[PDB]
């Protein structure tokens, strides 16, 4: 019996880690603005390391989150680049998955020389309906054993919906 346990897309989170401060961030931020439609966020280097050449509290990366039909269509563009094929090792034991691309214009952005070329990281998180119980402020609790997702379901769900393949 599965009356209402159909998976959905809570959100899609994507990030770019250039690894060095300066105007590269500002132009990289502009990329996310045109792609998503929202305004992005700046991170802060937690631990300084001379080797990589980064100091603490120095912005080095950007990311944005999307939910709803926008998330669906952005995910669809990404998978079209990846040829509707993923590796079996891209799925967590808890039910999540993600991947990455190499050059940001495998989809349509109509390259301009005044920006450059970048790469993006996609990570997509599943869930079952009814997870407010673990995020509401009053009378919080943990979802029961039976009602949590494991790795075999998500790959099963992914294969049928997109008619993909895993190696």
């Amino acid at each position: 019996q599965n009356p209402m346990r159909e998976l959905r897309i809570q959100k899609l989170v994507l990030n770019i880690s250039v690894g060095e401060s300066g105007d590269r961030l500002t132009r990289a931020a502009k990329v996310l603005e045109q792609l998503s439609g929202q305004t992005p966020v700046y991170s802060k280097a937690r631990y300084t390391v001379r080797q990589f050449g980064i100091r603490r509290n120095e912005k080095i990366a950007v990311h944005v989150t999307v939910r709803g039909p926008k998330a669906e269509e952005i995910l669809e563009r990404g998978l079209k680049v990846k040829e509707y094929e993923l590796r079996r090792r891209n799925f967590s034991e808890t039910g999540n998955f993600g991947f990455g691309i190499s050059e940001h214009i495998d989809l349509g952005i109509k390259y301009d020389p005044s920006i450059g070329i970048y790469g993006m990281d996609f990570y997509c998180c599943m869930t079952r309906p009814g997870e407010r119980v673990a995020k509401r402020r009053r009378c919080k609790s943990r979802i029961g054993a039976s009602h949590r997702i494991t790795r075999e379901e998500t790959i099963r769900w992914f294969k049928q919906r997109f008619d993909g393949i895993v190696r």
Partner: peptide, 24 residues
Amino acid sequence: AVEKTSTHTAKRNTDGLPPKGHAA
């Protein structure tokens, strides 16, 4: 255009690279 507030805490007044000591 907004700055994320890191959850992680660090010693109030220290200027140290992360102490690892493991692997190389």
